[PDB]
Amino acid sequence: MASAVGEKMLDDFEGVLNWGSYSGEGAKVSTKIVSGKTGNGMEVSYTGTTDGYWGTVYSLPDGDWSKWLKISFDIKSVDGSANEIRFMIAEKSINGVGDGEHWVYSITPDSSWKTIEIPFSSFRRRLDYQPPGQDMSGTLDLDNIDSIHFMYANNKSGKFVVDNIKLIGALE
Ligand SMILES: [Ca+2]
Ligand SMILES: [Ca+2]
């Protein structure tokens, strides 16, 4: 139901596809529109390897979501299994150049379209690698978000698919 509960839309694909793709070392990416949980969805196909890299990216219309508690998507593994991800979010630079801090998940879907509400208290840093104009607040700042990033935690050739990408408020 609209305008009655504490959720706000990030992307439900009813426009033009703004998302990134890239690869190397024998892996591949293909992003395309499909049918989803309301109107259209998005599917993403891959080849995967072990020592390579394969990726898809989004830049947000809002990055100032301190009052919100969770992300949500309705998502499945359409590779032939149920495969996991180590996916990433960037904080804004305190020098106004590059990025400010890097923060990540470890999570898995299944083979069917479940809603996956994940809170801000899920995360840890990207621990090899951080910016020169950095934040050191000891935490992720939802006040201060720049961009979001796919990262590999499986080596499959296969697919994944979504609709309904949102922010969710508290449960009080
Ligand atoms: Ca949709
Ligand atoms: Ca921070």
Side-chain angles (χ1 to χ4, degrees), residues 15-163:
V16 177
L17 193 164
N18 71 291
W19 291 65
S21 308
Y22 59 87
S23 60
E25 300 183 79
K28 297 191 178 185
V29 195
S30 303
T31 52
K32 62 282 301 297
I33 297 302
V34 294
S35 304
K37 282 211 180 188
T38 179
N40 79 255
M42 189 179 73
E43 183 175 88
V44 65
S45 312
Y46 275 84
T47 310
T49 57
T50 81
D51 185 69
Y53 62 100
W54 52 121
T56 179
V57 177
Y58 172 96
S59 206
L60 325 97
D62 206 273
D64 304 284
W65 20 270
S66 304
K67 74 185 70 191
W68 304 83
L69 271 294
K70 314 185 181 170
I71 208 171
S72 188
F73 28 65
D74 292 74
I75 186 165
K76 68 184 99 158
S77 204
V78 44
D79 71 316
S81 296
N83 268 288
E84 82 203 66
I85 65 184
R86 276 276 290 172
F87 98 94
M88 169 181 168
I89 302 189
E91 251 185 62
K92 303 168 192 187
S93 181
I94 83 167
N95 278 347
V97 158
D99 311 297
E101 214 179 13
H102 302 140
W103 288 97
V104 315
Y105 287 97
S106 315
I107 61 180
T108 183
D110 66 80
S111 312
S112 69
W113 262 6
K114 293 296 302 300
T115 315
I116 315 191
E117 302 187 351
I118 331 156
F120 88 94
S121 54
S122 191
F123 288 70
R124 80 293 291 138
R125 281 172 168 160
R126 179 68 211 291
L127 274 152
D128 184 66
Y129 161 95
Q130 295 288 333
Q134 72 300 122
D135 163 297
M136 301 200 79
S137 67
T139 197
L140 73 173
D141 293 81
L142 283 53
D143 187 54
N144 190 81
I145 308 301
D146 183 282
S147 42
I148 76 181
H149 275 286
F150 174 98
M151 294 184 73
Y152 41 97
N154 73 83
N155 305 118
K156 286 300 209 71
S157 303
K159 303 193 179 186
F160 295 88
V161 66
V162 293
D163 204 4

